Amino acid sequence: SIMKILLIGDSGVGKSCLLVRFVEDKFNPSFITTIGIDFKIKTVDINGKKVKLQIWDTAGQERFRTITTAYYRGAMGIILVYDITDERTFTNIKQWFKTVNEHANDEAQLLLVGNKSDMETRVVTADQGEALAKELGIPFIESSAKNDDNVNEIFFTLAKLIQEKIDS
């Protein structure tokens, strides 16, 4: 069938790069901010089952974040992304979390992603992210759209979680 998935998080954390790296195996070194929202798709196989993922890449910019909250309701999966080199984007996850609860479904599967694990300039530790994840009650994973680490895992695991949910 089809799974609607959203990527949310501060502007600059790498939502678009994780998406491009996953769907087109490329990486843009430049910063090309997302206006309002973007939409892509890819077919994944969940234990034999071929599932279509409709990925909604949202704008992190504050002004374009009203267009987004409207897409929350109806999403089967929501990926909250922060930048491990930017402490502010991590602290902001809590606010993103609240926004999600006010607009998402009940059965929506969340996932926290600490992106840019390839950077020596990291300021947010893996343990910090795991701790935030345990406190929010959602799964956690670190990634790097640049070196392509755990990028596919992000989407495959979220799909599997949603699918497991579909069986109940």
Ligand X SMILES: Nc1nc2c(ncn2[C@@H]2O[C@H](COP(=O)(O)OP(=O)(O)NP(=O)(O)O)[C@@H](O)[C@H]2O)c(=O)[nH]1
Give residues in contact with Mg ion (CB under 5 A).
15-16, 34
Count of residues binding a copy of itself (CB under 8 A)? 8
Of 15-23, 40-48, 68-76, 92-100, which segment contacts ligand X by CB under 6 A?
A: 15-23
Binds a copy of itself by CB under 8 A, chosen from 12, 38, 46, 92: 92
| Strands lying side by side in the sheet with 49-58 | 37-46, 49-58, 2-8, 77-83, 109-115, 140-143
Sole binder of ligand X in the list 23, 46, 119, 136 (CB under 6 A): 119
Is residue 60 a contact point for ligand X (CB under 6 A)?
A: yes
Q: Does 66 bind a copy of itself (CB under 8 A)?
A: no
Report d(CA 15, CA 129) in Å as an integer.
17
Is 106 assigned a ligand-binding role in the annotation? Answer: no
Closest CA to 94 of 108, 115, 105, 110: 110
- Burial call 12-50: b when 16+ CB within 10 Å, e when fewer: bbbbbbbbbbbeeeebeeeeeebeebbebeeebeeeeee
DSSP 149: B
Residue number with CB closer to a copy of itself (87 or 107): 87
Sole binder of a copy of itself in the list 26, 52, 73, 88 (CB under 8 A): 88
Q: Is 69 in the site for ligand X (CB under 6 A)?
A: no
Cβ-Cβ contacts under 8 Å for 128 (sequence gap 6 or more): 90
Write down the least CB distance from residue 58 to ligand X, Å.
7
Residues found near ligand X in the complex (CB under 6 A): 11-17, 28-34, 59-61, 115-116, 118-119, 144-146
